[PDB]
Design a protein around this nucleic acid. Sequence first.
RNA 1: ACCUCGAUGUCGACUCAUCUCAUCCUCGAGCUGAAGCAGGUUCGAAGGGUUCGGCUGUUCGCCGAUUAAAGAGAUACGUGAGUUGGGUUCAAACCGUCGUGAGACAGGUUGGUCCCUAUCUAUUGUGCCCGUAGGAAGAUUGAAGAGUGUUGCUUCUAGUACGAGAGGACCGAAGCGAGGACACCUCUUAUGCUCCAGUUGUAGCGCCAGCUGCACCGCUGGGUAGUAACGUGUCUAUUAGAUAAACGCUGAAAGCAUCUAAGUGUGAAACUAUCUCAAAGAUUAAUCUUCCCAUUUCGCAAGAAAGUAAGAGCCGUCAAAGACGAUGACGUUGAUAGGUUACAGGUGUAAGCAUAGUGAUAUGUUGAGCUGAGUAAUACUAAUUGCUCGAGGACU
RNA 2: AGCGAAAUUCCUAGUCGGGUAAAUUCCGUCCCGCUUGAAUGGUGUAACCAUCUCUUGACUGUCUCGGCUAUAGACUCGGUG
RNA 3: CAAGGAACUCUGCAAAUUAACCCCGUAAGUUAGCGAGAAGGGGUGCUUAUGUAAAAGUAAGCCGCAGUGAAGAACGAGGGG
Lengths: 119, 118, 230, 56, 122
Amino acid sequence: SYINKPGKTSAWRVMTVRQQVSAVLAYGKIETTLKKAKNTQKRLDKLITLAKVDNFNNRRQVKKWLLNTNLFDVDQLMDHLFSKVAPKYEKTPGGYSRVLKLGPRRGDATEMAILQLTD
Amino acid sequence: KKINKQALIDLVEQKQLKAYVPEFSAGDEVNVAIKLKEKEKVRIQNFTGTVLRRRGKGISETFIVRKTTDGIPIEKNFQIHNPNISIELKRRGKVRRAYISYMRERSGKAAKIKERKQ
Amino acid sequence: MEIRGIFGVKVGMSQVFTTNNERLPITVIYCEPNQVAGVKTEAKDKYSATLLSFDTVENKKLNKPQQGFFEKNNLKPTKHLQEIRNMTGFEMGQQITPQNLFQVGEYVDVSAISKGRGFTGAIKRWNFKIGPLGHGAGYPHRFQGSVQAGRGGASAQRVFKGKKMSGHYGHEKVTVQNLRIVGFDEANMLVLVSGAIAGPEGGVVLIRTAKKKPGVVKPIELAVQTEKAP
Amino acid sequence: AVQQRRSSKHRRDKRRSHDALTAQALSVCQKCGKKKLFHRVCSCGMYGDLRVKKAY
Amino acid sequence: MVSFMTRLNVADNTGAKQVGIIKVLGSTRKRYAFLGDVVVVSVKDAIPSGMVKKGQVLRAVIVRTKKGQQRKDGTHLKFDDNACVLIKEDKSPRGTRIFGPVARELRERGYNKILSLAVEVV
RNA sequence: ACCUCGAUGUCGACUCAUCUCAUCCUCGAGCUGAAGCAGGUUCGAAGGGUUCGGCUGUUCGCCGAUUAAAGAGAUACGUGAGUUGGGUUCAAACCGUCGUGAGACAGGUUGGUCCCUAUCUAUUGUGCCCGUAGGAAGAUUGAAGAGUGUUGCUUCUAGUACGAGAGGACCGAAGCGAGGACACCUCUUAUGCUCCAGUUGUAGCGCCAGCUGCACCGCUGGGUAGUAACGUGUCUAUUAGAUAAACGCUGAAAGCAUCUAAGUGUGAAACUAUCUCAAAGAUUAAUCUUCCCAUUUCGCAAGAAAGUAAGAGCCGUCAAAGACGAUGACGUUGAUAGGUUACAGGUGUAAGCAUAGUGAUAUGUUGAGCUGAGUAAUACUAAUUGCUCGAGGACU
RNA sequence: AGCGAAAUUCCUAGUCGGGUAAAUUCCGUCCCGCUUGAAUGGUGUAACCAUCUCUUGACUGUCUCGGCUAUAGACUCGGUG
RNA sequence: CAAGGAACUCUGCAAAUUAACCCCGUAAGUUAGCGAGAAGGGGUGCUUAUGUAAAAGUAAGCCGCAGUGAAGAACGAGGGG
Ligand SMILES: O=C(N[C@H](CO)[C@H](O)c1ccc([N+](=O)[O-])cc1)C(Cl)Cl
Ligand SMILES: [K+]
Ligand SMILES: [Mg+2]
Ligand SMILES: [Mg+2]
Ligand SMILES: [Mg+2]
Ligand SMILES: [Mg+2]
Ligand SMILES: [Mg+2]
Ligand SMILES: [Mg+2]
Ligand SMILES: [Mg+2]
Ligand SMILES: [Mg+2]
Ligand SMILES: [Mg+2]
Ligand SMILES: [Mg+2]
Ligand SMILES: [Mg+2]
Ligand SMILES: [Mg+2]
Ligand SMILES: [Mg+2]
Ligand SMILES: [Mg+2]
Ligand SMILES: [Mg+2]
Ligand SMILES: [Mg+2]
Ligand SMILES: [Mg+2]
Ligand SMILES: [Mg+2]
Ligand SMILES: [Mg+2]
Ligand SMILES: [Mg+2]
Ligand SMILES: [Mg+2]
Ligand SMILES: [Mg+2]
Ligand SMILES: [Mg+2]
Ligand SMILES: [Mg+2]
Ligand SMILES: [Mg+2]
Ligand SMILES: [Mg+2]
Ligand SMILES: [Mg+2]
Ligand SMILES: [Mg+2]
Ligand SMILES: [Mg+2]
Ligand SMILES: [Mg+2]
Ligand SMILES: [Mg+2]
Ligand SMILES: [Mg+2]
Ligand SMILES: [Mg+2]
Ligand SMILES: [Mg+2]
Ligand SMILES: [Mg+2]
Ligand SMILES: [Mg+2]
Ligand SMILES: [Mg+2]
Ligand SMILES: [Mg+2]
Ligand SMILES: [Mg+2]
Ligand SMILES: [Mg+2]
Ligand SMILES: [Mg+2]
Ligand SMILES: [Mg+2]
Ligand SMILES: [Mg+2]
Ligand SMILES: [Mg+2]
Ligand SMILES: [Mg+2]
Ligand SMILES: [Mg+2]
Ligand SMILES: [Mg+2]
Ligand SMILES: [Mg+2]
Ligand SMILES: [Mg+2]
Ligand SMILES: [Mg+2]
Ligand SMILES: [Mg+2]
Ligand SMILES: [Mg+2]
Ligand SMILES: [Mg+2]
Ligand SMILES: [Mg+2]
Ligand SMILES: [Mg+2]
Ligand SMILES: [Mg+2]
Ligand SMILES: [Zn+2]
């Protein structure tokens, strides 16, 4: 068998986590698959904890993950994350995001999951 | 009843570690005195040469020394914390990596490492 | 014979340099003091064995039947129970450590559960040869090997029982014999055993007296580093 | 390879004997009462005591 | 680990520039030859003013290997080329001098003449 | 010419081997035109082993170098629903030869499509149900079994026994190996696609600097955990019993003799155990320990209505496990996973700034910064306050 | 005439030399060429060939000898079938 | 993919080496056209200055294991039918 689909390559995986992490930071909720939510949580938490000092080095580090969304660009998402979201989690010892399980999709039966920011 | 495996591993390694263990980077020339044992006595045989690598964490700390005799280059892997082995750093040199593999490819005037390091 | 046995948990593997100028790889085993939970006699049972208790745990993590047995026998609650054959000469309810059992450098054999590897093929399991890769080839490259014994009514016409094919590999008890004990650490309750021990780090391990060399003890002593400070 | 003999209607059911289904575990929501499958958010988006999503 | 039909250099004065292994002497299906091992070889590149001629089948012992071997203390000896010296039935070297360094593994398996005729042992 | 022409794929090679003994090596013994060493022949013995190459499609065969040995056969001259198609044997073309010819040749040469998703049985693994006569959780014995079993060199004994000499031991002991097997990743290596660093082109972040996407992971040098050998640990012993060939002691039938008939021995890598693994579905269903059942009424008792516990399962977090089941740890009375903190290992002095240089760039802050899985703490997040199954053991 | 163990030689793995540790293949030569041979042409020939055949340098997983990683399958779940 | 490098196989099948530009050098044979990109080698990055219409080049300096740093670019020699 040949001419197969490109597949869930490593580059595709990094882009998927990047896309989801930008959206959950913009809006605050993501409705994805459970196995995909369980992978974006690591990157989401890591980004938030490194963005607690708000120095220019941390902006360059965060910019390797954020992507343009509908509600914010790549430069106001920077301001939204570093001025609104991250300052809230100033003394929480990790665990800023929660993943909970919804029902199965009607057309796939895959287990859905909501990823949210725990206030 | 929590078991920190590394602490116990560190303790067994500490049973036979050495006190001084002088330091050297990748590109350094050292003099290693092997205390070879014959039927009787010891003949201190020197293996002065250039370091190529330093890997390991404890009793398993090893380093690579390269020498050239009669135009033939020979590389020899020593263990740092091994008895009857003495290491004496001679020249400290500048390299931009930890494993300088190209030294086993470059030879002659191009196999000389500039002094100084930080 | 006079078989002595102890249980411990493998924590990792290291090396030590020894006198006579040898570098000996060793395995490190954390050995809790084992408690003799039962003794079974030749006259009363038709065989002789000693059952000990080890790997102590709190009472709330143990099931009701087992904790009832432990409180009836007046023992420390432990979740692990196993016996060794032909182990005699120990009173019930006595703490046993390898220092009283084995010598400094005697030969012992060790049994442990091998590291699980799952469903492996014939080549990785039975050390079979791989078919040719070039010069023209076919769909089966990693072939197990023809299982034909005889075609026709006058011959077997069946694959013989116990054939060597793919299947489960790993997670199986295996014993390595004639391993020399290197050192004892009373304070840390830590036994040093030469060679490599099967099983993942943290699994259970049984150390027994070697049946090939029961009383043989080969001397071994470590090296003292004379390295003077600068 | 193909069956040289047809499989009857009895061997077929014997093989299907292991195709039976299992009833997924269900529980009761603690604020509205409808049955929901265990360890998952109900239809109102109210899991435990935390309002997760807006009501259906 | 020098193997069957491997071209390697000769570190002596005998007129042989390239030598090929024929059999790894010592047992049946002896896969490799490590330091100190004896092999049967054939001279393939020789010189006019040499004691050996091209095409002769002879017996040699290996002294150097690119792969190298590990000693008991843990030291790993590693050269950059496979080398052998031509020996006689009695185990005495055929050449009058030995070029380059030689290993110590020869000393256990006799070969006292090669070491004494070597430049420096390693 | 009995089966098969409504199809039984035919040489050789590769992989996997199994069986027989008419035994090539190893093991034991008798005889020798057997001094010793090395042989010859016969008997017993199938446990293991029985090499790599050159030429040929080759089997065969000759030759080369080793080995203790390079055994003889059978299994559809084993093995194409396992591989190959070099050979034979399609269509093409030529040579020699035959034929007036189209054409032909176990004469030669070049080229030339090898399909199938496994239903039953057989086998390697892993499960559900039920039984084992109350239920459940643990620990066992072992009926019937499976796996391994190869051997060389050096030293000593001892230049002793023997032998004019030359040469050169049996028995026994030690050391070092080859092949095979099991396990492991300290050491040496290979790999290590969300790790580090260097770096090219192009498109973006409005520009510099600094990053991102793509170009085999873009390329290159290293590399954590894991997986493996080319790596390093172990095994490939020993002993007992009954014996084959063989040798016996004591002894008659047959006053002698005689290994045998009674009695009593010796005796091999073969056999039965000792070694490793699995094993009570061993229905012939075994043994031991612990825990939980021991209600109110009606009538009908291995009866009813309700009513009583150990435990197990569903679900969730998982990995010492793993195709899926299962195995194992945990589920708030918790460190199971993620996150955080600290550290290890790895990479190799980060960005920014300052100095120097005309610039590329170097120097100092700086063993700095970064880091997938690794270590250990920390309930911050996810393992909810849930549901179901489950017991009084007939009588002799 | 030329050529000749040949895309031709049965005997034949013909003799000898070279190439290799070792050469039923290859190169040169020898000639009882069973049955070569001159326009169904004979003998040579520079260049050329997805032609055949043999030796060789570098090169490499073709192999000693197998091992690791990533995708798409296979495998599990839902739908068609 | 370490060491070996055709030991594999009917056969180096397949895979691997070389690969662009510039500068040196290039044999036997021949129908004198070729052989021939023969074979065999070297340099390539960035900065400054000099060079030009632009270059190419030249000189000095700097960095890296590696400078058509990634993509696309001929493996070769000898004998025979
Ligand atoms: O017909 C075939 N085989 C026939 C079956 O009748 C039979 O097995 C056969 C095989 C080989 C053979 N031969 O080598 O001459 C003759 C018949 C195959 Cl060619 Cl499909
Ligand atoms: K037929
Ligand atoms: Mg890509
Ligand atoms: Mg095909
Ligand atoms: Mg293929
Ligand atoms: Mg039959
Ligand atoms: Mg029959
Ligand atoms: Mg029906
Ligand atoms: Mg089914
Ligand atoms: Mg007939
Ligand atoms: Mg008839
Ligand atoms: Mg028939
Ligand atoms: Mg039919
Ligand atoms: Mg068929
Ligand atoms: Mg016989
Ligand atoms: Mg036996
Ligand atoms: Mg050849
Ligand atoms: Mg026949
Ligand atoms: Mg056949
Ligand atoms: Mg046969
Ligand atoms: Mg026949
Ligand atoms: Mg078949
Ligand atoms: Mg076949
Ligand atoms: Mg096929
Ligand atoms: Mg068939
Ligand atoms: Mg053919
Ligand atoms: Mg073909
Ligand atoms: Mg035709
Ligand atoms: Mg005619
Ligand atoms: Mg049975
Ligand atoms: Mg390690
Ligand atoms: Mg820029
Ligand atoms: Mg015996
Ligand atoms: Mg006996
Ligand atoms: Mg008598
Ligand atoms: Mg019955
Ligand atoms: Mg964890
Ligand atoms: Mg800096
Ligand atoms: Mg003539
Ligand atoms: Mg002529
Ligand atoms: Mg010919
Ligand atoms: Mg010849
Ligand atoms: Mg041919
Ligand atoms: Mg000829
Ligand atoms: Mg003619
Ligand atoms: Mg004429
Ligand atoms: Mg004519
Ligand atoms: Mg001609
Ligand atoms: Mg053509
Ligand atoms: Mg897919
Ligand atoms: Mg489906
Ligand atoms: Mg390689
Ligand atoms: Mg090489
Ligand atoms: Mg072959
Ligand atoms: Mg060959
Ligand atoms: Mg090709
Ligand atoms: Mg040419
Ligand atoms: Mg000719
Ligand atoms: Zn609700």
